[PDB]
Amino acid sequence: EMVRKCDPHIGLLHRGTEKLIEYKTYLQALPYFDRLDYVSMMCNEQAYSLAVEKLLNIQPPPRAQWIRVLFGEITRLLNHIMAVTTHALDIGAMTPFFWMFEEREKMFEFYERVSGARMHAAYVRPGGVHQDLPLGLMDDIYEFSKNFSLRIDELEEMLTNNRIWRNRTVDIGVVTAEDALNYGFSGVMLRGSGIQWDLRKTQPYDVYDQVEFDVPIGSRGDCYDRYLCRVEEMRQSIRIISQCLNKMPPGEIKVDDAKVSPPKRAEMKTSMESLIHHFKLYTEGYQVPPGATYTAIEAPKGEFGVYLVSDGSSRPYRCKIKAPGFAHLAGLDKMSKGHMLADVVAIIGTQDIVFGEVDR
Amino acid sequence: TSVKPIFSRDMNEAKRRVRELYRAWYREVPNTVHLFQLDISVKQGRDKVREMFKKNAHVTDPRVVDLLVIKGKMELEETINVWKQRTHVMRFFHETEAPRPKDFLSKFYVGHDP
Amino acid sequence: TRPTVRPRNDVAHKQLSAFGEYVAEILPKYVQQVQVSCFSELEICIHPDGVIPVLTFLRDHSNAQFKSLADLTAVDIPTRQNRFEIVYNLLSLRFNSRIRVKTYTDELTPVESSVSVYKAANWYEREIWDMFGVFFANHPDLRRILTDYGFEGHPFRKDFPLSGYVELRYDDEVKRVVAEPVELAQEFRKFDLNSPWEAFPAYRQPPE
Amino acid sequence: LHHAVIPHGKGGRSSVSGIVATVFGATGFLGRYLVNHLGRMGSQVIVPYRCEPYDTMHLRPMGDLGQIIFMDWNGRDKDSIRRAVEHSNVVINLVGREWETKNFDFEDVFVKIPQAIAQVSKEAGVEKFIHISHLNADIKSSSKYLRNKAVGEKEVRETFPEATIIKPADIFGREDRFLNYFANIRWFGGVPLISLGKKTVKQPVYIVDVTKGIINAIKDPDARGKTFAFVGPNRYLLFDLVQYVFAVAHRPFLPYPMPHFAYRWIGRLFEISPFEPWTTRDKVERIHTTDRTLPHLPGLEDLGVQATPLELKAIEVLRRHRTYRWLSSEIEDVQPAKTV
Amino acid sequence: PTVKPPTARKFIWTNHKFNLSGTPQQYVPYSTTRKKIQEWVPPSTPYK
Amino acid sequence: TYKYVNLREPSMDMKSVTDRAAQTLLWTELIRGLGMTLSYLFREPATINYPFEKGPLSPRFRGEHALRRYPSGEERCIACKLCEAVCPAQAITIEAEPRADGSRRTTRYDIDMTKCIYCGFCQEACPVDAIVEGPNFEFSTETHEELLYNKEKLLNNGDKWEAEIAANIQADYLYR
Amino acid sequence: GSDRSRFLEGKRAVEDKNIGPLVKTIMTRCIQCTRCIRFASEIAGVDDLGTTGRGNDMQVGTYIEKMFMSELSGNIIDICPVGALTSKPYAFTARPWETRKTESIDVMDAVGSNIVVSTRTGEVMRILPRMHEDINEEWISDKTRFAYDGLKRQRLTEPMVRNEKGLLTHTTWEDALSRVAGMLQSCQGNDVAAIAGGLVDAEALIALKDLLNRVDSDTLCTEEVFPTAGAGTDLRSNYLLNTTIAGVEEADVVLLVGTNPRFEAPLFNARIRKSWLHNDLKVALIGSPVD
Amino acid sequence: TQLITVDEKLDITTLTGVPEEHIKTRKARIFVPARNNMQSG
Amino acid sequence: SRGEYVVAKLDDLINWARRSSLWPMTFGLACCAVEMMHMAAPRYDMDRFGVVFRASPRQSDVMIVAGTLTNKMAPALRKVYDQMPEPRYVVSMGSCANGGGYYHYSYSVVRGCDRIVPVDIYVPGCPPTAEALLYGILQLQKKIKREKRLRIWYRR
Amino acid sequence: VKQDMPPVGGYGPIDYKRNLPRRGLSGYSMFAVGIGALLFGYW
Amino acid sequence: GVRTSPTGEKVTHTGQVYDDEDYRRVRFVGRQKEVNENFAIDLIAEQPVSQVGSRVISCDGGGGALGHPRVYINLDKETKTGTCGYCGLQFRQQH
Ligand SMILES: NC(=O)C1=CN([C@@H]2O[C@H](COP(=O)(O)OP(=O)(O)OC[C@H]3O[C@@H](n4cnc5c(N)ncnc54)[C@H](OP(=O)(O)O)[C@@H]3O)[C@@H](O)[C@H]2O)C=CC1
Ligand SMILES: CCCCCCCCCCC1=C(C)C(=O)C(OC)=C(OC)C1=O
Ligand code: SF4
Ligand code: SF4
Ligand code: SF4
Ligand code: SF4
Ligand code: SF4
Ligand SMILES: [K+]
Ligand SMILES: [Zn+2]
Structure with missing residues (x-):
């Protein structure tokens, strides 16, 4: 049972997403991104949206940037509930899975209220978001965030000081810093090893320079410091949601360049130019200027990037999707050396893999 | 016309690599019939290997046959290690497919393809 | 142009232009172009014989320290005689910066594998073998990574169609999943969407 | 010819083969592979089913969407038969039982229901009707199966004169009751045989040969009104046939003579079960009936079907009956049986 | 709807139906268009 | 702006050493975990009694598709094919011609529900609010081809669910 | 243009026109660009389209229920930049x-x-x-x-043969090709001929010519009579438009003999009218006095 | 040296994985697409 | 007759015991398995219906194909379905398992799992909600309830 | 206008830190209880 | 106003019905052909022609942003009514 070689064959979920993106327009290529990291949906939407907006040379309105960061931290809570609870389920603590998926169910209700779908919203779009917040949503987000800390507290009560949880994760999967940078790791996989790097601080996007939070830094590079980094990122995500609920500005939620974002339906049915722009944006779409960008954001699994190549047409020429899980699952073979099967399952837990973004 | 090689300087080393690869497949086929428990004879699998080698027998470019040796070694590694299954090995035996119309008359009868 | 237009970061544009001059004059053996985009991204277009000399520079040079390999990508552009465009995306955590190192190959020229510089590429260029057909010389374990095991052809080449040449189904005669030639019950409806009117005069090419 | 039934496409799963088939008894051994080989051509297959719809589940992935229409039918009800055949351009008859049940006998299965299906298909305008008899069908045969199947062949020929009536010898496949039957007398004892099984000769035919024969009889206009005899290429005595079965499966083959008056008492001992019986005296009479030679009838070679011998498909059938200690041995690691 | 009734129409179903899948009242799909190419009808007279 | 998770050194006076030794020998954190699990034993579970109790939904919810009509009986779909031009999976197939009064209407309006990705681009691209993605989500079938809706099935979905779709559009249409 | 409207007023609605079964007319969409009038005046040579009115009520039309039926009357569907002149058979379809x-x-x-x-x-x-x-x-x-x-419409889709009662019935390709080749094998010499139609490509023409040459038959005809007295169809110069279609732009005098080129070859007539309009061509006609 | 002299014709048909039916029996058409006469651009 | 009544009540007994003790298997593929975990979550709670996972195919009763079936895993799907003892059932969850879905025209995707396994219940959505999946499971229970196994045995 | 907005004074303070409340006895008390139970059982 | 072919099969509002000799009726055997009996072409004839006193009228179908785009309809022809392109509601100038 001592592991001598790991060969993870992948591509069992290779759907050929980023060839299907080439034959569809940018708005049609947006819902492919929801299904890559399918526990981090609006973060992938936000990364693709920032890539398209960077090529379009336009910026979102401020309220849509605050809504993007609010639902990005809700999305980070979703992914870290998934990560921690299924890592513990794959170790054996199967009960806080059931404890935290009710909270995850409530955040899926928040998605279903703001966008109409529980998981795959196609809500965060190039130009802002699709639709404004419904009335009464933010008060329920406050009533959720008021109580979520007790849930993190009781998860941390069940696992953090537990000796059986420590004996499965403390000497397991140690990653040195130079081999972490060499393997192209990102996110918690660096931050468990002590590499002070977070793209919401260092290379900040929409309004992450306007919210103050902390970045948890691990000390031993093991599964247990990465566990504590994910629990503390749930804490800090509650902190950023408090700051975003207090600091939500009024205004619109799409870019008012109506050759990019569609007009309202109240003005599409009255104005001529708005009808022409609605027609041409929902059939041809907006033309992105030629050029290539690499826009990467801090998704809750790490550096999630889009390398987007446009040829001036209304469709992408190339769209490479850099996932963190690809490089993390590459480094699995080094991380699993000297361990056993019951430790390699903890290593695959602490490398939180969603294979839709690993395989595309 | 001054190009960079992959492995072979010319066609002699290239034919050496094709020859070694056919040696490796010829040694491999009885194990492939045995541990995949294929219901074909060993001669039938060796003739399929000979058919898959004679299919590419018209190439005169050393780089292309270097890549064919490379891809054949990749399929050989997928066959030695049990990474293919019984389906992936029997996909070289197009058995569920109908015999396509060969002459002009039956292709005329069934459809429009030349 | 304040609310709806992206603001321009001229400081990062100037800094990346100066570092592009720096890299172009340190390594003129391989560096072909250096260009800085309007949203301040740097591209070092090199020769495919300088993969290992340039990337070991940017991994190790004390003014570069691009210690992270973000992404490795090929792009098929069939109208060039070297139709594949290998793209190295690099992150310097010291200088909080990103760089792009682009090179080129056709189907038959090997590109030297950059696993000696960044081990992260051990799967990425492996994927470039799987998706595009670019062979990487002196790679440790080069095989397919995403396609099916008996998959012929290279998917992300633009001469390869969207649906492939085969499709799978279960067959109860042979009790086995079989591959047949693909027949769609509905053809993928190709939409001609390009407008005949020019959208961007600044990107206008000269005529013949 | 109607415009919706013109053959289009390249003969794949989603194509239009122009064949609208009502396959009676498609939930069995021949109907499995028949609906397989039809639905891969892109045919509209109507499957009337008597059984549970769960027992029809394996017929659902065999074709494209809407190409297999399941519908209820009763053999003692012409209304459901006319409900099934009224749109088809070919009806295939695969209704059969090796044993007679509480409500059905061999005359209901082989004389009543096939004449009903052929008569209703005649009076609904179905051009092509395929009936499946047995090669050893005879009025004076010792087994009630072959007697009622000869009577049913006569009735189908007289009430549908353009019918293609097909004679298979003894069909083997994965789901057969011929090589599996010969396998499963390592449970009971030492595989008893009438006169050591050396006074009867068999030429068993492979099931995909029979299936390609049925489909090439559908596509052939010259197969209308013929009578085909589908036999395998090699004739075997029953002794070395059973010896080759027990040599592929690597079981201890120790035969012994059981007389004719006592090997029917074993036949009535297993047909007193209310379930599907393990054997019967009719199966005793038909394992020990020689496969007759009818050279005047056309065969698989006259429909373009190359007959597959037993030494290619017997490993495919009989790998299931092996123990682990000889489970992975090959097709060539056995001496073939002696032909005649 | 006892307090805020729905907006009544002439086409809204007065008889709501539950899920009919598996029953003889189930949806069977079909092409909702007519025949595209009209075929030639040969004349019903002798050519002599 | 960063914090060190797990950089605590334990106290080495005899009091804290005896406290950790009692924690080790007498299993204090194990009793803490048992206490938290026993605390959840005595709670009301979140299990709603499906099918009698339903999960809460919004008037933005995207379920089964339906073709709407004007409040006179006339259907809304004027064959403009924006819904199949923006459909990210090409689930919508439209064939049209002028009908017997010269009106621009469809003869074929097919939605393949087994290609459909339920993202609602068709209901936001429709200029006349004809195609919508209504509130029904309990429409599982026992056969694949029952999930290939023609124009008749979609108009019957509209006629079935109109008394709810009109109210949900009335609740949401100012946000659109 | 811009992306939104400052127009907070009520629009006009122009009355629709009926100029034929070919051109669906919705004049409210018309932007008064007068490509109608210049096409019908300069290429179609009709002079029956115009603008009646003055100001915002200026309406492109014919002023009366007059039907715009030229042989080129649908090309205004091409050069209407808006949807005011659409193809009525193509209308609403795709x-x-x-x-x-x-x-x-x-x-x-x-x-x-x-x-x-x-x-x-x-x-x-x-x-x-x-x-x-x-x-x-x-x-x-x-x-x-x-x-x-x-x-x-009226398309041939299946091979038909005469049945026993003398009516065309549907049959397979094998029966049709067997019944044709069985009579072709009993013909030789001038016992078999071939009339080529109007719409038959050169591949089928050389196919049937080689087929009847295998029977040794040279009797192969077309429906349109060309005289063979003299050089016949041997030289190519005595049956072609040897100048060119474009050569009318180089010519200064055109003698039309025995033809109505408006309806036999309409765009050749349009090229003659373009030379007539721009190059001052002198046209003379021997034949009936057609327009 | 580190370069070889290939005078052969460039042909990668055995590498692209296309079946023979779509190599030898297809006719590629190379053309500038004509202007749609519904538009002036 | 009495025997028809006895086999009818025994059909009712075995259909009750099979629909009220459905054991699905821990088998998801893509985003639908997250929602299938939400159908296991304490709000919708499959376990109150007797619906509980068993990881081995030998001790499972239904296979919920929850996600996208690619070409590289279709033989693994078929062998996992084959290693389930009869009676075994298939619930197809989501658009990619139903008919190819959002990756329908892709080179690498099996266009619906009904090309591979016989499918009983098609659950539509991208993803279908956990409530819609539980609706499909209860419709599968209603399909098991009206099975006529021993009646058809008694009549054949 | 009407829009989903925070209230005028903002939302309330939200807890986001660790609260593991340090319950239980000390070490010497639990060993005293255990040794006393031993002595009672032995007597 | 749904009608019925001589096969017994109902005719859709398109005009679709399978022929008697068409095998594809077998999909409706034992099951039902789902047609919608509320024909839009029948239900728009039931609407009264709106008599107005203006020359150019406007239609948005009702609801404002709940209907269709607002088109402007000319009522100069005293022979023909003025039909909306979207809703099919027809108008007439009453003089
Ligand atoms: N080796 C062989 O088996 C040979 C067989 N044949 C003939 O070929 C035909 C098919 O053979 P095979 O598949 O092996 O046999 P099976 O018994 O396995 O198949 C019979 C089929 O008919 C149905 N059926 C049986 N009895 C009745 C009945 N009384 N009423 C309605 N349906 C019924 C069965 O379905 P259900 O689930 O409803 O019972 C099944 O689909 C038969 O006519 C047989 O005589 C000929 C030569 C050799
Ligand atoms: C016991 C609690 C319910 C578990 C139900 C698991 C059913 C199978 C889902 C597949 C799956 C597994 C195993 C899984 O562990 C996982 O990781 C979070 C997934 O998402 C990427 C999965 O899709
Ligand atoms: S919801 Fe999306 S995928 Fe479905 S029909 Fe509408 S546009 Fe297409
Ligand atoms: S967008 Fe609306 S009106 Fe246009 S074709 Fe689609 S459903 Fe019909
Ligand atoms: S071509 Fe069109 S836009 Fe121009 S005048 Fe004629 S109708 Fe008006
Ligand atoms: S498509 Fe053009 S002509 Fe038609 S209504 Fe729109 S702007 Fe006017
Ligand atoms: S049907 Fe859609 S949402 Fe569901 S698993 Fe598939 S890709 Fe994900
Ligand atoms: K026009
Ligand atoms: Zn209107």
């Missing part, structure tokens, strides 16, 4: 993003007009012109544009 544009040739006349057949899901939707400076500059006749719906 949409140009989903149409597949296959570049092909006319066969409705001997002009050989370059066209785009645009289809949709395996069904021909419409026929547009291609640009070609030497044939049809970017126009086509109304027959070329609108005869594609005869291409989907």
